[PDB]
Design a protein around this nucleic acid. Structure first.
Length: 92
DNA sequence: TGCCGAGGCCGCTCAATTGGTCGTAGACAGCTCTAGCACCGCTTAAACGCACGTACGCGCTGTCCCCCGCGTTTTAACCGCCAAGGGGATTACTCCCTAGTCTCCAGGCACGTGTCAGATATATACATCCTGTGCATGTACTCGGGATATTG
């Protein structure tokens, strides 16, 4: 049966930024772990945020707050400026 | 005087880094998967978000009124130092034992499916438990006066 991983999107993104470069298989497992750790931290914090405010859904703002808590510094104001591109394009 | 003695500049030789070149071996990138099952598109009947006075709760506000802050300097030893001594942390070697490799070999069990049940969800009726409110005392508190402990 199928096992499923993020392994292709990290490779796709590598060819976005370093078109000559590659990854060893052992160094893929790192990205395939890291990328789902940050998934869980955002899901867990966004879940608590909905609960504290006694909502049921989790709209964009329930995540933009979870990113603006969880990320340390310039990464917060960058990631917030990056995600507000994506939904602004999607809703056209 | 003397002598020379003590004195100050320049090619071998060895010993790490540094960068170069050789060749070869899995492991990476990529193809074709093919394959399939998830994403999507397409409806539906759907829940839950949300833009919006008003009762009004409390966040913030204008006063006076005092300790703890604020300021000084003596001193007090705290903290720093240097120098010496002893060993115990260190170095370099030789013998030694096993860590590690590979290879064979089995069955333990983790893996997987095959069925379908006792499980828990959902509704309606409902009674009851639990909250919010209102309400006496009982204590834990702040003070004053004296006894015991301890610092210098």
């Amino acid at each position: 049966s199928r096992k499923e991983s993020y392994s292709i999107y990290v490779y796709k993104v590598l060819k976005q930024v370093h078109p000559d470069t590659g990854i060893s298989s052992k160094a893929m497992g790192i990205m395939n772990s890291f990328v789902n750790d940050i998934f869980e931290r955002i899901a867990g914090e966004a879940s608590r945020l909905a609960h504290y405010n006694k909502r049921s859904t989790i709209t964009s703002r329930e995540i933009q707050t979870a990113v603006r808590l969880l990320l340390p510094g310039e990464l917060a104001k960058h990631a917030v400026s990056e995600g507000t591109k994506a939904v602004t394009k999607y809703t056209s």
